[PDB]
Design a protein around this ligand. Structure first.
Ligand SMILES: N#Cc1cc(NS(=O)(=O)c2ccc(C(=O)O)cc2)ccc1Oc1ccc(Cl)c(C(F)(F)F)c1
Length: 372
């Protein structure tokens, strides 16, 4: 079937989408969560043709390639139970997840599904900062009722625009992570919400479902910078995991304003000194910062298209590294779970992977190959 790996944990996984409010300033997220039932693994991975058009634009091609992607991938599933009921009787720790440049909310389901299978609720935000390849919203309530979507595509920047616009974007991304957290926490305490999407998952199930002290933010690339900006602004997030962070968007002021623990998980082949030096600026003896590098990995080992092609085409497109993609994502996910247990205070068995936080594995490098 799909080659996106099923979650390794003992919980079955459901998935749904939530948009509220309906406007371009509302929150849009894909939720992965522990499900009551494991009926059938039928979640559509990339759910609209316009995402494929957006990806082609991001990759520098035109509408013909978008339609080719749609033919290849437009019916692929990802292994979660679409709209399955939430598993009752437990309060779950919560992760807010931020996607990279040219991605969108559905492209990190390998991570989201594995976290949910270990008993997390995961809210993968879709950013409206024009960093997503595509996203959509509704211009009024009637448009939402009809499914009359307004699409917003990735913005390309002139070199003169990069410093200012990328910092504006990372600030909007952090606001969107904090707004998504507030939406979920408000639903958890009984706020009535009318999902702008008509879906057979009743959001009232989320009432009293969140362990409100155990909140983390995780993100890849642009989303790794978003982790750091979000932690700086919002202390409801108790720790962060930055997956191959692209640090360029961040202003100098954030590096001293992050009280929470922070974990950098890097690929071997993406990092460079000008990027790594900003990660080192976060280090201080009064704070917990950990860094590991996954041997033989490329930037996109963290994103779902690392599973979507064969070994040789994937390597040529830089979707795959020297390391097997399942081995790489398992290391990132297991090290993440250990870090989350330690700094959220979970009473699980994730500390069996504490050694991964130290880089103690044949496929891990403690710290970074970039000595700067
Ligand atoms: N999965 C994911 C995925 C993730 C991202 N965001 S990112 O990982 O942060 C990232 C950031 C920057 C760069 C760069 O500056 O190059 C790259 C990546 C963007 C597009 C993606 O989707 C495809 C990527 C490649 C290809 Cl070939 C296709 C395909 F054509 F096959 F559909 C889709």
């Amino acid at each position: 079937q799909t080659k996106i790996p099923r979650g390794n944990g003992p919980y079955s996984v459901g998935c749904t989408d939530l948009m509220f409010d309906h406007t371009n300033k509302g929150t849009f997220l894909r939720l992965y969560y522990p499900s009551q039932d494991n009926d059938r693994l039928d979640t559509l991975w990339i759910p609209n043709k316009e995402y494929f058009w957006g990806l082609s634009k991001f990759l520098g091609t035109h509408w013909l390639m978008g339609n080719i992607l749609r033919l290849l991938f437009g019916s692929m599933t990802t292994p979660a139970n679409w709209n399955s009921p939430l598993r009752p009787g437990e309060k779950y720790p919560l992760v807010v997840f931020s996607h990279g440049l040219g991605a969108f909310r559905t492209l990190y389901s390998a991570i989201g599904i594995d976290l949910a299978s270990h008993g997390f609720i995961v809210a993968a935000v879709e950013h409206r900062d024009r960093s997503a390849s595509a996203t959509y919203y509704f211009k009024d309530q009637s448009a939402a009722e009809i499914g009359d979507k307004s699409w917003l595509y990735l913005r390309t920047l002139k070199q003169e625009e990069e410093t200012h616009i990328r910092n504006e974007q990372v600030r909007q991304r952090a606001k969107e992570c904090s707004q998504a957290l507030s939406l979920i926490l408000d639903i958890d305490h009984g706020k009535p919400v009318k999902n702008a999407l008509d879906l057979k998952f009743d959001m009232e199930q989320l009432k009293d479902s969140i362990d409100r002290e155990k909140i983390a933010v995780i993100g890849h690339s642009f989303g790794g910078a978003t982790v750091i900006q979000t932690l700086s602004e919002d202390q409801r997030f108790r720790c962060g995991i930055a997956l191959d962070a692209w640090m360029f968007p961040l202003g100098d002021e954030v590096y001293s304003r992050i009280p929470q623990p922070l974990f950098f998980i890097n690929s071997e082949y993406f990092q460079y000194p000008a990027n790594i030096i900003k990660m080192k600026k976060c280090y201080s003896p009064d704070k917990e910062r950990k860094m590991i590098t996954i041997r033989g990995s490329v930037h996109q080992n963290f994103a779902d298209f690392t599973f979507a092609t064969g070994k040789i085409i994937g390597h040529m497109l830089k979707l795959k590294g020297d390391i097997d993609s399942n081995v790489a994502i398992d290391l990132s996910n297991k090290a993440s779970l250990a870090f989350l247990q330690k700094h959220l205070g979970l009473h699980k068995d994730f500390d069996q992977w504490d050694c991964l936080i130290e880089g103690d594995d044949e496929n891990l490098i403690p710290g970074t190959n970039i000595n700067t």
